[PDB]
Amino acid sequence: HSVAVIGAPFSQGQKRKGVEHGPAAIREAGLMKRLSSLGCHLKDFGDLSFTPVPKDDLYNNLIVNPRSVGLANQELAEVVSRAVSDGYSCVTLGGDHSLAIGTISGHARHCPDLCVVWVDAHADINTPLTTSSGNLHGQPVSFLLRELQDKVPQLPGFSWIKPCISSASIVYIGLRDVDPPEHFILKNYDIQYFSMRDIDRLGIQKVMERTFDLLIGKRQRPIHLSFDIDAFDPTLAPATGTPVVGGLTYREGMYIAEEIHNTGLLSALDLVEVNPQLATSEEEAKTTANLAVDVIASSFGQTREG
Amino acid sequence: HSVAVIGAPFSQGQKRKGVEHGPAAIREAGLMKRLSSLGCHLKDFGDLSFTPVPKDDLYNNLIVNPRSVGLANQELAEVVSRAVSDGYSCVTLGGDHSLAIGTISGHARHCPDLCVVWVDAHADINTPLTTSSGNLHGQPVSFLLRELQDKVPQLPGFSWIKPCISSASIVYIGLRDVDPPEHFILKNYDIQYFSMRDIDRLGIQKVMERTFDLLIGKRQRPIHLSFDIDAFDPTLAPATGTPVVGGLTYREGMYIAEEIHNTGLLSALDLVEVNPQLATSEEEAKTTANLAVDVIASSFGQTREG
Amino acid sequence: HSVAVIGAPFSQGQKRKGVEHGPAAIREAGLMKRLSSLGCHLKDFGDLSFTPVPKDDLYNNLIVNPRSVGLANQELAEVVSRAVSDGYSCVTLGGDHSLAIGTISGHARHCPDLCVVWVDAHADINTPLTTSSGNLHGQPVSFLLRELQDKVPQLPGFSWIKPCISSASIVYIGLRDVDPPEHFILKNYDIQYFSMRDIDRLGIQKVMERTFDLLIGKRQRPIHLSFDIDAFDPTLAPATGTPVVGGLTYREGMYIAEEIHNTGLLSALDLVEVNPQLATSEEEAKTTANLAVDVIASSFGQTREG
Ligand SMILES: CN[C@](CCCC[B-](O)(O)O)(CCN1CCCCC1)C(=O)O
Ligand SMILES: CN[C@](CCCC[B-](O)(O)O)(CCN1CCCCC1)C(=O)O
Ligand SMILES: CN[C@](CCCC[B-](O)(O)O)(CCN1CCCCC1)C(=O)O
Ligand SMILES: [Mn+2]
Ligand SMILES: [Mn+2]
Ligand SMILES: [Mn+2]
Ligand SMILES: [Mn+2]
Ligand SMILES: [Mn+2]
Ligand SMILES: [Mn+2]
């Protein structure tokens, strides 16, 4: 089993400095040794340097860094597509969540029947017409879902995207901070999600059972796990840009990752939004990075029973 | 929907200074803006000034401030009764829990078929003959329950009080610090409760289901939610007078409030025992107040899925 | 109901200084008063002084202090045997977990059909041939299980030990840090365990129900509860030698202890691995000791409903 690791020090999907240091932080927390110990053959692509775009003015006076986000994602997609085509399960370290535009595009370029498990406090499904922040890290799913495209305008730097993934092929876990237009979208397009309230009711075991029945209950499909560290409670993952109280416990996060591993179908994984600069202490920074490593390792087979 | 907000800075139901500043702390945490954002039409009564009673000596050399507690509650009951009669859902900010004598009395005046959900680490059902502290905030239920009245002595300042509620019409959630005479009372009078142990066994979803079956299983009734912030684990609500380890999680507390809102039957709510002076840091005081606001907002419709 | 308390300030089953101060820390947290208040008649044996062994050199260049651990356990077994023979439920305060060799051996002398509930982050079932640390506190179960004895070499100081119980007579609860040889042993000998993952799935109520069905489902048996404080999440029990993230919550630990009491069969209890010197603050040391007292008190009848 072979794993590719790509650092994507992405910060222009949002406004807070420091998230570009996520990949280094996760690596420093021992990611590569942990994967090796599990028996993963590794190819490290290092941390990418993305091509800058001159005069990348706001789109519609609101959407920030659109060409820079578009181009960085186009470049990322090429690296991801090549890794997956070469037989690697592809781990991308963020960086802000706008990079999932590139990792999912690149993954789908080799594996068009992929499904997505999106683990996050947020749905990240605002469009350029509904976002109240202008930050592309809160919009990436809108560019990817086929059924939404007639409601998503063409941004500069975004023309290369081919959104063929169905709204029936993504399931959210963890949701507790959803903007009203996002809620409208989830309901109107019948997109399946398990909010923190659903987890409180069902328990994480049944959440994972139902998630897989929805996505792979009829046929085996490669799985893309896009994991925003802010899915965890801020007490566990404080070093992140949009923390929301009442999140996943450590055990719940490990359980999600274990069930992902147990499918035997994990094909790519994003671990995004670790921002070491937002920690109030080096301890807070390190615990957040340690947690990120635990998620990735559990997704590739680390168990609690040995 | 119209919501009345009443500050009741009572402290004389107990001995620790500062709980009178609970209402202010909860306001400062953004309560009014939060309720407005949900669509609530608001009538703010401000913080009431209760008539003092000079030389309010101990009763039976134990009971603390009985005439003051009795009179403040008579005054509060009139304000609550008037607000309910004007069609408001009544939110009362404490202040110590002895104020529930007044809010439930005032509420029952126009809604005699009300039921009570009492969320608390404690049962608050000692009588003047069983209390070992003398503090009236640990006795309010004893004055309210019809079945107990031949066991409750007449206190100075308490003659206006009629027991309004049957023992079958209150359910406790959260109990973990119960005095032996209270346990005797709960068992002897078949009063229904879900202790922290019951929550550990059933899960909060089932606890709320059974709570409503017990109270509103046969008919719709107005609901009085009396919520003591100390129901929450002290790590979440440290600024309170009688913290007890092993409490509700943030998620459980939100779930309770959501289920209350989902009945469509919430008619009055108490949020008591926030004492900002007992915080060891201003952060501890603020987080307790923020949590109080979260409870009240969720009880009137704030959701985690937006 | 009579309870014996034995301090066993064992440290030579491992390499970190300070665990020998565990018994004092637990006593200082109010253990004896708490047990008396529940109605337990107490015999305090004090803290034992074990006979040292000169030149207690490594066995096989790896196993640390074998003669010292062997002799201390022989001496402890004598005290536990006497206390059980005199009709006391025997509480032993550690000290490192190698002391369970002595307490279970002593207990089994008069109560050979005892069963063991082993609450721990670890299985402690390495043998002298599988341990990678050499630390006997991670090996005690290997010496106790009859099915394993063809695989357990004879250590100096260990000749007195007769493998007491069957592999079908121990159930683990809480496991999350298991060495590969231990995992092999648990599987190969069909030893039943509930890892943290199993708890996440089943809930602690079902875990206790199934534990009792496995051990006492068809006959009543005296229970030996061997409780390593590291079963709890390190946020709750930081003062311990081998903390592992993702442990039991406070409520889960109380529930386990409550169920043990509810069987009416508790015959001996170990509370081990509290090391106050490993706390980073006095508060960390005290909360760990306080938790130890709560476990013991709940195991002997302290309830959360009064
Ligand atoms: C929920 N929507 C937000 C947050 C996006 C977080 C991105 B992710 O990668 O971390 O999950 C926030 C919108 N709210 C901000 C606060 C005021 C109300 C709107 C947005 O900026 O779109
Ligand atoms: C449980 N009963 C107590 C606490 C009441 C808390 C009031 B509430 O509004 O906050 O829920 C405490 C009884 N004491 C007996 C043993 C010594 C300390 C507690 C009392 O004072 O009656
Ligand atoms: C899991 N086995 C360990 C820990 C024993 C803990 C003893 B107990 O009483 O506290 O539960 C550790 C094995 N090591 C192997 C990998 C490197 C670090 C741990 C051992 O030393 O045998
Ligand atoms: Mn997020
Ligand atoms: Mn995200
Ligand atoms: Mn209380
Ligand atoms: Mn109360
Ligand atoms: Mn252990
Ligand atoms: Mn142990």
Side-chain angles (χ1 to χ4, degrees), chain C residues 97 120 122 124 126 131-133 135 137-138 177-179 182 228 230 242 273:
Chain C
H97 219 157
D120 202 319
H122 312 96
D124 298 353
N126 277 296
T131 177
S132 65
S133 64
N135 300 332
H137 75 152
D177 179 19
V178 180
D179 301 327
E182 298 180 291
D228 188 328
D230 74 23
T242 64
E273 299 285 356

Side-chain angles (χ1 to χ4, degrees), chain C residues 278-293:
Chain C
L278 295 181
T280 62
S281 69
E282 200 61 38
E283 177 203 31
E284 279 195 350
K286 297 195 299 190
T287 195
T288 305
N290 288 344
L291 180 57
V293 171

